[PDB]
Each structure stands twice: as C-alpha cells, then as structure tokens.
Amino acid sequence: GRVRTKTVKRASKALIERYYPKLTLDFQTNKRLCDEIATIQSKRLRNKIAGYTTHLMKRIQKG
Amino acid sequence: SLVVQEQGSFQHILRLLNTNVDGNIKIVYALTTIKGVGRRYSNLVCKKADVDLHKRAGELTQEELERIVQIMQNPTHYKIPAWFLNRQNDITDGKDYHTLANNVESKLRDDLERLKKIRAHRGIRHFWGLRVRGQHTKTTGRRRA
Amino acid sequence: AQHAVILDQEKYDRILKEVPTYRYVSVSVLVDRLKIGGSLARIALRHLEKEGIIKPISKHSKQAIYTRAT
Amino acid sequence: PGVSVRDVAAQDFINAYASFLQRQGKLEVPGYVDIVKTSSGNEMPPQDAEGWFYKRAASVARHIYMRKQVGVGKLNKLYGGAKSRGVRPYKHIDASGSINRKVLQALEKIGIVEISPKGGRRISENGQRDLDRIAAQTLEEDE
Amino acid sequence: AVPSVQTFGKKKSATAVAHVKAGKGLIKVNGSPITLVEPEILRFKVYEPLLLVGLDKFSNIDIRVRVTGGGHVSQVYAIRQAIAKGLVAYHQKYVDEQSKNELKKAFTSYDRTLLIADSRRPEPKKFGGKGARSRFQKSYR
Amino acid sequence: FTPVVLATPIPEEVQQAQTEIKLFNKWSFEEVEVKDASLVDYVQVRQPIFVAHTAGRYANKRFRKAQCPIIERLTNSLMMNGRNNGKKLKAVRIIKHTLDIINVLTDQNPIQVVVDAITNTGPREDTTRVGGGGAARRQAVDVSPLRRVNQAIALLTIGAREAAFRNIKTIAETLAEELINAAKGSSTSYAIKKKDELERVAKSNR
Amino acid sequence: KTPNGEGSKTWETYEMRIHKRYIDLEAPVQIVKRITQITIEPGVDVEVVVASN
Amino acid sequence: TPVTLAKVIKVLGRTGSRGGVTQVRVEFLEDTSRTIVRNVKGPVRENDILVLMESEREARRLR
Amino acid sequence: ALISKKRKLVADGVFYAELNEFFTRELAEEGYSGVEVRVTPTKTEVIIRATRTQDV
RNA sequence: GAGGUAAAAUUC
RNA sequence: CUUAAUUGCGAUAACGAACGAGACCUUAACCUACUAAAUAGUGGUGCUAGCAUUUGCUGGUUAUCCACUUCUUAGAGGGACUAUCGGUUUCAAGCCGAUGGAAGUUUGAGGCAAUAACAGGUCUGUGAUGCCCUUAGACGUUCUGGGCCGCACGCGCGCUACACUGACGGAGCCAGCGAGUCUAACCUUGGCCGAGAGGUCUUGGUAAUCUUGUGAAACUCCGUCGUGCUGGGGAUAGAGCAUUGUAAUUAUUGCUCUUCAACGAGGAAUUCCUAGUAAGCGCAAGUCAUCAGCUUGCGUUGAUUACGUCCCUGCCCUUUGUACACA
Ligand SMILES: [Mg+2]
Ligand SMILES: [Mg+2]
Ligand SMILES: [Mg+2]
Ligand SMILES: [Mg+2]
Ligand SMILES: [Mg+2]
Ligand SMILES: [Mg+2]
Ligand SMILES: [Mg+2]
Ligand SMILES: [Mg+2]
Ligand SMILES: [Mg+2]
Ligand SMILES: [Mg+2]
Ligand SMILES: [Mg+2]
Ligand SMILES: [Mg+2]
Ligand SMILES: [Mg+2]
Ligand SMILES: [Mg+2]
Ligand SMILES: [Mg+2]
Ligand SMILES: [Mg+2]
Ligand SMILES: [Mg+2]
Ligand SMILES: [Mg+2]
Ligand SMILES: [Mg+2]
Ligand SMILES: [Mg+2]
Ligand SMILES: [Mg+2]
Ligand SMILES: [Mg+2]
Ligand SMILES: [Mg+2]
Ligand SMILES: [Mg+2]
Ligand SMILES: [Mg+2]
Ligand SMILES: [Mg+2]
Ligand SMILES: [Mg+2]
Ligand SMILES: [Mg+2]
Ligand SMILES: [Mg+2]
Ligand SMILES: [Mg+2]
Ligand SMILES: [Mg+2]
Ligand SMILES: [Mg+2]
Ligand SMILES: [Mg+2]
Ligand SMILES: [Mg+2]
C-alpha cells in the first residue's frame, strides 16, 4: 500500500551513520530531536524519517 | 362510524344534467364526471347544501339532488365570491357565467369561432391543429392523435 | 372484481361471524376475503374495536393490526 | 406537581386545546372560511369541512409560547410546503397570508396573544393562564 | 457551588451540549423530557444510556441537553452521545475511577460510537457530476 | 426489578423488561438457535440489538459485513427501487409490523422465523458463466456461506415487493407471508420457488 | 477553464480570504494621534468609530 | 437428498475468466482425514462450514 | 464611501490590476518590473519599482 | 520427477 | 521481488544527476490545553410571567452585575508514524491480522502536474495579430420592426410519472455552503389589505450584528382514499386577476378556475457508481429588470453488492514477428 521514497531513506542514512549516540530505538526521543539537529520543512516528512530510523534501530541490535 | 341498515334503496349511476354520473363512490366525485366542472367546484357545491362529505352517493333524496343542480345553475347568488368561476368578464354581456355539461363544448367552439373569423394569431394556430401558447415544436408534438 | 362500499343485511351478518374466527384481520384481509371496499374496511375496524370483538396490539395510520379476543 | 406545555406531547395538546375552544364558542370568524385553500402551494381545501379553524389556532398559540416572538411571515414559511407545480420539480412556496393574520387577530381580542415590541407577537399573561391549565388536564386523563 | 460538568456529542452537523448539573434526577431535551423524542422509532436509541448503565443511576444530577444544527436522525444520535459522554464526565471528577471503568467496559463491548465520535464526513462534490464520485452521462454519438 | 420514583415520568413498560435482560420494546431476544449449520458470526443474536436502525460502519471492511444484524439487513434490502432510496424510518416500521403478523399465527416466536427464513431460502449451489465461446456453457460451482445469507435477504424482499405491487395487501403484510412460507417450504412463495429453480438448472450444467 | 466551448467541461474555482479583527481600547486621545501614524501596513484597513452613543 | 458439510482449511486463490470463482480446499466434518478441492463462488474465509450438494466431485481450472 | 468589505477589497485588487498593464505599456522602454501600493491616510503611496529610474 | 486447450471477425 | 508510482530492496559497463510521481499547499475530521470574544455562547445574581407551591420547573428582559470558553470562531501549535505486537518471503524492501487510538485504502477529497505531439478548439474574449476583403446608396455605427422559438421527421442531455414503501388534508419542524443598497433604490424583517399572486406603511443591516435559527424538502404523526387509464399522471386548451419592463402578440413569469390526454415498469442496445459513496430530497450562488426544468457548491435521509479478474473495451513494461513509417 505505502512505500517510502528515496529522500526519506537518504536523510535516515545520514542520521544513523553519525548520530548513533544521543538516539535510541524509541520513537518519541527520535521525533523531538530532529526539530533542531536537522532542518526539515514539514511535520509529515519529519515523522516519516523518524519513523524509518526507529525501524532500522530495531534491526541493529538483532543483526 | 355507523353502517346503514334500512333497505336496498341505494342508487348508483343515475344521470343529472344529461351527462352520466359515476355511481357508488364518494359524493364529492359525483359531480366531477361532468365535463365543465372540476374537483374544486364539486367540493364547494357539496359544502353549501348541507351535504355530508363522509358518505357515498347513498340515499340521494330528491330534495337533495335538486339543491345541487340549483347551485350549479345559479352560482353568483349562492355565496361564491366570483373569483372561483371559470368564465369571467364574458364577451357576450360582461357578466360572470359558469359552464355546464353540454355548455362547455359549445362555448369552447364559440371561443374558437370568434377568433377564426377575425384572422388573429391566437385563432389561426387552431386551424392547423398546432400549439398556440408559443413553445418549441421542434421535437414535441409528433403524434397527431 | 367489484367491492361493495355499502353494507347489506346479509353481508352484515357475515362480518360478525367470520371475523372473530380469523387469526389475523386487517384492512387488506377484509378487502380480499370479505370482498368489501378499501375505504369501507377502515370504518369496520373501529366498529369492532369499540364493541370489544377485536383487540389491537399495534395501531398505526398506514398499517392496522388486530387480533381475536382472548 | 408542576407541569408545562413542553412536558405535554406535540399532538395530544393540539387535539385537546382545539377541542376546548370548540365548546367555548368565542371564535370570531371573518367569513371567508370553508372556501379557502389556506395556502398557495396546496391543491385541495382541508378535509375536515366543519370547523378546522381551531386546529391552526391551536398550533399558533403553542408556536408563540415556545419562542421569543413571531410574525406573519414566520407562520407563512413554516406552515407552507412543496407545491405540486407539474412537469418541473417542486419548490418551497410560502403559505397564505390572510389566514395567518386572522388567527392572530382572533387570539388578540381573547387576550392570548399581544403585540410584542420590536416587531412580532409574544404571549401574554392570559395566554400562560389558559394554555397551562388544560395542559395539566391532558396528563391527568392518561393516568 | 453546585457540581456541574458539560460535554458534547457530534454527528455530521448536529451538536448536543449537555449540562449535567445537580438536582433530583430530571432529564429534559430543549425543555421537553426524554420521552418526547421526535421520531417514535428512534426514541429507544436515546434510551440506550438509560438501560445498560443501570435503572436510574441519577440520584444527584440532572440532564439538560439542547440541539444546534443537524437533521431528524442526526440530532437523535447526538443527544445519546451527549448523555453517555456527559455521564462518564461526572463519574470521573467526583465519583471514583473504579466504578467508572465499569461504565466504560459496559459501552466497550457495546461500543456503537457513544464514548467515541464519528469521523465520517460528507465528501465534497466535484465538477461534471451531481454527486461527489458520480458523473452525469456521456454519449458516444 | 426494584423500582424507584424519578422526576421525569418513564412508564412501567420501559423500566420492567428492558433493565433486567436485553430484549426488544416488549418482545423476545431469547434462546432461539439455528436449526441449520452453525454459521459462525453470521447470526447477530447474542449480542442482540435495541431497534433495527444503526449507523454502523459495517460496509468499510470485507469481514465486518457479516457482523451487521439481520434485522437491520432486512431494512436495508427494503430500501431500493428508486423512490425508496433512503427513508429507513419507513423500512424499520415495515419490519416492526412484520414481526407483529408473525407473532399472531400459532404464537410463532418471530425471531425464530426470520433466522429460519435465511437458512431455508439460500440456494445451496450456484452456476457461473465461463468458457465455451460463441455459445457459452454454464458451470455449476459451490456458494459461500456469506452469499447464502446475501441471496436469502435479496430473494425475500424483491418477491415481497412484487407480491405487494398493484394489490390491497401492503408491504409488511406480504413480507410476513414470505417469511412464514420460508419456514416450511412448500413452493407457495417467491424464494422457495427461486431456490429450487436455480438448483434444477445447476443439475443439468454440472 | 476554457475560453471557447470545445473540450471536456473542466471547471475552475478561485477564492479570496478576508480576515477581520476588532480591539476595544479605553484610551486617551493623545495616544490616538500616535497609534494612527504608527503600525501602518499595506492591504490593512484601520477604522476608528465613535463611542456607544 | 443427503447433506454433506465441509470445513475450509486452505484457500488457493481466484481461478476463472472474469475472476469470480475461488479454488478452496475444504475438509469434511464427518471425515477428518480426507479433503477435496472445490470451486466456490462467493467470499470464503478459513474455518467456514459449507454445504455441498455433491459429495464426490474434483474441481478443475475454469477457462 | 460606504462600500462593503466583500467589494472594497475586491475593488482594491481591480485597482492593482488596472495599474499593472498601464505601467507595463507606458514604462515598457524603462524596464518595468512590477509595483506595490501602500495606502496611508493623507498620503497614498504607490511605489514604482523599475530597473531604470532616471528615464522614469 | 506430472498439474488444460482451438466459434465467427471482410474492406477504407 | 515489492508498491498508487522509474516506488524501493537489490542485481549489475556503468557511475553520479536533472523532471514527473512522491514531497509541498488548500479543505474536511481530533484535541475539557494556550492566547480571547455584548458582532459567538453558557452558568450565576437582580427584575418579572405562568404552573406546583416545602427547596422547584419552564421562559422573558441588551451595557443591571460578575465569572467562565465546554460548543462556535481561528492565530500559534500539538497529533499516526501503517506506532506497538503476533505471523509470512532466504534475509531485506513490503504484505496480512489483532489491540490501542478522533482517524491505519496515499487519513478522506482536491490544487499543482514532465518530455514529445495534434494541421484538436477559439480570428465570434481581447485596442493579441500577419494577410486578404470592405471603407460611406458601409461586411463601420445607430434607430424601428422581424428572426435566432418557424417544422410531416431522426438523435443527445435532463425533468415529471406510470402510485396504497403512495397521493391528499391538518399537525410534528431539522440544516449547511452562501449572497446583499453612494452619491442610491439591493437583500428584506414587522404591522395592515387581498383566496392567491401581490400591494401598502415603516424599520434593521455596507453585514458572525438585520433578512437569518434562511424553524427548506424528503421526512414524522393523525385522517381521508381502496384499486377502477382512480383521488396516479398535469400534457394540451379556454376565461380572469397581478408583477417585471419604454415595449411581453409567438400566451416573460406568478396566481385562481376549468380542460385532465399519453403513460399498466419500457424492445435491440447503452451510461454512471465501492462508504457517509450510489440514489432520493431541497436550498444557495452563477447567468438575472423578469423567467432553470441548467450548472457550480452545500446540507438532509442514506442502501444492496466486490475487496477480485484480464473475459470484453482499453492502457503501461519487456520479449518476438513484420513486405507497415500517411504507421
Ligand atoms: Mg344525476
Ligand atoms: Mg374527496
Ligand atoms: Mg399550421
Ligand atoms: Mg406542433
Ligand atoms: Mg406557455
Ligand atoms: Mg382572506
Ligand atoms: Mg469504535
Ligand atoms: Mg455533497
Ligand atoms: Mg454532457
Ligand atoms: Mg440479487
Ligand atoms: Mg428489489
Ligand atoms: Mg392496495
Ligand atoms: Mg499539508
Ligand atoms: Mg475550545
Ligand atoms: Mg503530462
Ligand atoms: Mg472554440
Ligand atoms: Mg460567443
Ligand atoms: Mg481570442
Ligand atoms: Mg447614391
Ligand atoms: Mg455610388
Ligand atoms: Mg455617390
Ligand atoms: Mg424607425
Ligand atoms: Mg424577435
Ligand atoms: Mg390510499
Ligand atoms: Mg404529507
Ligand atoms: Mg419536529
Ligand atoms: Mg437603510
Ligand atoms: Mg453565523
Ligand atoms: Mg426547526
Ligand atoms: Mg417529525
Ligand atoms: Mg444511447
Ligand atoms: Mg435551485
Ligand atoms: Mg437564479
Ligand atoms: Mg481494483
């Protein structure tokens, strides 16, 4: 039904490769931290980036 | 209410003003079969002669049938405010006349005769049997009967 | 099929006998079975309800439901 | 026990208030009753044929008490309906103006309705005396 | 002061403001009681927060609901939402939480949108059709 | 049921039977089961309903169509053919009188007849049109338990409309005549005949 | 959307949103002659009306 | 005529020209060790008890 | 005066649209780029924003 | 390692 | 392989980019929190009317007197991200189910929308325009009258119907999107006159204020009607009363009486539509001195039946065939 675009996966790759400290696998600490450390224009695309970093932080401690 | 139980004196289809009356129905539609009067005029006459509208034709006493005809032959004297009649400000004498059973067929012919002998456009359109009230006859009116 | 809007004496005796025999009576019951008019069938329901022969379990303007006396 | 007209239902009050003024006789008819359609959007005169001026008057007298004030033009838009105009579909047509005025002129000489300031007509102290007394008689009959 | 809470229930365009103030247990809708709902069929829909919760449960508070906007069915489903939401409001701030969850689980298995609004809204109409999704007709020749 | 005085007058007929067990106005939502196969989540009964009018969202999901009450689904199928689109308050009143006519003849608990009308008017095997070319041949395939509920409501409201067309009998009168004949099938109604006709054709096409 | 009559019947809409405020200030007339020459803005109407009588 | 019940255990998918016939492998309730694939018409979920008019009939692919 | 705000604000847009084409045709040879209007009491300001203002 | 399948349809 | 998608996961003589999609924007939904409201509402206190009178109940009254912002309005914001969890594909992109939640079909619906192309439409939108014609007994302009509405016939879009789930008469009485007069005559309340149409005397509103709660229709109740081209149907036609306008004859239109036909569910064919959608229903706005039966928006009542397939019509992506390239 829904597939994320490339620009969500581009910015999420830029977040994980350098902000592995100060971020955990919880969404609410991944959502309010992108308000200042990144310049995202809209809220809708901002939650889609933090919704996809949270999806990838779950599968780092697993494998 | 109450069902009548006297005898078999019920009277159906019997004719008044030379045109037949539909029997064994509501008394407000006994007059509506007459060509020239309608449903509104039949309800007004039956409310001025002390006639119960919750009945059929029923008994139809001869003292009651004559009062219905008396109203229809003299409408301008029996409390009708003259905005209710069909033929008003007549071309004959300027009075207010009400048409009857065999009268509305003759007066409609006389209303078409005085327009064909003066060569007016409201009357010449009836000579070919076309529409006179000025509408599009492009698509409609393709039957002739 | 013609329907009688005016009662007869031989037809009035038929109403008082056959109606409490029936399980379900209504407007459409009296027109189809007893061969009376539709306008007359409404008046005959109030005549039997007032005397107490038929019993209303539901009363509505469009549909009239009446049962026998228990 | 305390009772008002809002505790009484919609049509048991109208069928009892119009039945009470039938016995009183104080009606003050203009004279053009029984020949009028009472609207310009209806098709037939009313089927009651003996009386039926109390029936609209019972509806108006309750319509004023439940509101602040109403006029003639408020009773023409509400009591009207869709007109069967013919080959083209319906349209909201206001009711007859002369019927709605003579009801408010007949209820004024009784003392029920009064001329309200700043437009419209409100209920009087005699209207609240009469319409609340027989409203108790509706609920006491059914219990 | 007297205990007075206030809620609302929303259908499409009908809102029902329900002031639940103290008293001896009277329920009135626009001055008229709850036994006078304008449909006779839909009168038992507003009775649904009067039967499942208990017989009375109204030993201290009154119910007063007015309507703004809507239709004839849309206002019936607004006043029954206003009572069920206006009942759990009074059983929160004064009555303890343990007896309110008994009311909440009662309207949970029988959910039927009483303690939850209806987010279904009418779709706007596009050009070409008399309705939202529809189209008039087309002729090939 | 421990009555109590209250400010606004609620009558005795409301507080007595509607506060102890979840029945109708004064009628029954009692222990009536199905005399057919189980039909899991196709019969609404337990949990019952108050009236037939419901603004639920049963048509959004493919699965939640069977969660709709069948008393409401009879009001939904008496709500078609032009002028009767909408006007559900007319449709619930027809079902209200339909349960009254059933309740008279041999006292006939009316929720038993409606459930049995669904299970005894559904065509047990249908035909589909596939293959052949030019002159196609019909193939007899099985039918879901959902469509046996869907075709039972359709064949009991269309035939009750055509039997109430151009005659003195009204809608709620002919509908109750369809349901009583559906309980004991004797080919005296609409849906009992159309169930047998769709199966005697399905025998020659398989 | 089209100037002629040819084509599919596509319609086109437009809108202009008008916002309006009012603030009641019991102020002396000295600050009135200051508040009019200050806070000027294009596309903004400023109206001063007489009192309650 | 006799009646024979069958419970849905596995569903295959849609098979037909117009796409209205579902291949469903039903298992009988009077025999829990024998199954026959049948062609149905309407919406069929798992664990549904169907009514079969003919007990023994192997379903083919419709074309 | 005495114009409703559903018509005065529309007529202010007509006032801007009427001056758009005239200052395009007249100031064509002067590098016209658009104007803005600023209404203030006792002095109405219309800013002529062009590229070359000495010829203007 | 096995798993379906034929009507007619001409010209600018 | 996966999606509405050249969406992505990945695979690789391609590596990095530019468009479209997505993003963005507008609107409809949610916040008992924020800043606030006599041009939006409620509660309380005074005065006052009626009913019960033991404390009540239902209303009225504009700077009496204060408090509040729950609804309504909308500034700044918050909020779903397929979150959490259980299965499934070799992991991975993704799919399916349940719970929670106002909302889990791209949240619903729109706006915008590439490259290349058409001998598509408009010279009758333009003082946008080449060329040609005309330029004064004018194919300039203006006035009077007529026409664009004529008609054996064919087609297209719509309206009303073929009724008793209905007509008709009383009564119940429920909305939203809107729109309205300055150097004038717009929307109209209220009171009288009139059967109606309407007329007259005044008033509010340059507008969340007044019309306006647009107390609209379907609808709901109570009655009449009882199957009969009937009381379903209102076409056609006669007479009269009025409004608009300098002017209405070819009846502008409204109203009242009378006329009261065809039509008994529509052949071969064919159109639209998947949820608050279809359909039924009326209102507002556009054109407007007057007239929609049209159209653009909006609200009210609110289904049945799919959650698929490529059979028909048709569109994308590759593979292949070609004597087609005006394809
Ligand atoms: Mg005679
Ligand atoms: Mg009559
Ligand atoms: Mg001729
Ligand atoms: Mg002709
Ligand atoms: Mg005409
Ligand atoms: Mg008069
Ligand atoms: Mg829910
Ligand atoms: Mg809409
Ligand atoms: Mg078209
Ligand atoms: Mg069917
Ligand atoms: Mg049907
Ligand atoms: Mg009948
Ligand atoms: Mg946005
Ligand atoms: Mg708020
Ligand atoms: Mg494009
Ligand atoms: Mg063109
Ligand atoms: Mg033109
Ligand atoms: Mg042009
Ligand atoms: Mg010359
Ligand atoms: Mg010359
Ligand atoms: Mg010369
Ligand atoms: Mg001249
Ligand atoms: Mg002309
Ligand atoms: Mg009838
Ligand atoms: Mg009616
Ligand atoms: Mg009402
Ligand atoms: Mg003025
Ligand atoms: Mg407002
Ligand atoms: Mg209202
Ligand atoms: Mg109602
Ligand atoms: Mg065609
Ligand atoms: Mg309109
Ligand atoms: Mg118009
Ligand atoms: Mg699909």
Author numbering:
A (entry chain R2): 2 to 64
B (entry chain S2): 2 to 146
C (entry chain Z2): 36 to 105
D (entry chain T2): 2 to 144
E (entry chain Q2): 3 to 143
F (entry chain F2): 20 to 225
G (entry chain U2): 69 to 121
H (entry chain c2): 5 to 67
From the reporting publication:
Here we present a cryo-EM structure of the Dom34·Hbs1·GMPPNP complex bound to the yeast 80S ribosome programmed with a nonstop mRNA at 3.3 Å resolution. We first programmed purified 80S ribosomes from Saccharomyces cerevisiae with a short model mRNA and bound acetylated AcPhe-tRNAPhe from yeast to an unique UUC codon preceding two nucleotides from the 3′-end of the mRNA. The ribosome is in the non-rotated conformation with a classical P/P-site bound tRNA. Similar to the previous intermediate-resolution cryo-EM analysis of a stem-loop stalled NGD complex, Dom34 occupies the A-site region forming mainly contacts to the 40S subunit and the core of Hbs1 is bound in the GTPase-associated centre between the ribosomal 40S and 60S subunits. As the A-site is free of mRNA, our complex indeed represents a nonstop stalled ribosome that is derived in vivo from the translation of stop-codon-less mRNAs26. Strikingly, Dom34 adopts the role of the mRNA in promotion of base flipping by embedding A1756 between Tyr113 and Lys44 of domain N. In addition, Dom34 interacts with h18, another integral part of the decoding centre. G577 (G530 in E. Coli and G626 in higher eukaryotes), usually stacking with the +6 nucleotide of the mRNA during decoding or +7 during eukaryotic stop codon recognition, is stacking with Phe47 of the β-loop of Dom34. Superposition with mRNA from native translating polysomes suggests that this β-loop mimics mRNA from position +5 (the second nucleotide of the A-site codon) until position +9. Assuming that activation of translational GTPases is mediated by tight interactions with the SRL28, it appears that our structure closely resembles the GTPase activated state of Hbs1 during ribosomal rescue.
Crucial for the recognition step are the conserved protein factors Dom34 (Pelota in mammals) and the translational eukaryotic elongation factor 1A (eEF1A)-like GTPase Hbs1. Dom34, similar to eRF1, can be structurally divided into the amino-terminal domain (N), a middle domain (M) and the carboxy-terminal domain (C), which appear highly similar between both homologues. Hbs1 consists of a unique N-terminal domain of ∼160 amino acids, followed by Domain G and the β-barrel domains 2 and 3, which are highly similar to eRF3 and eEF1a.
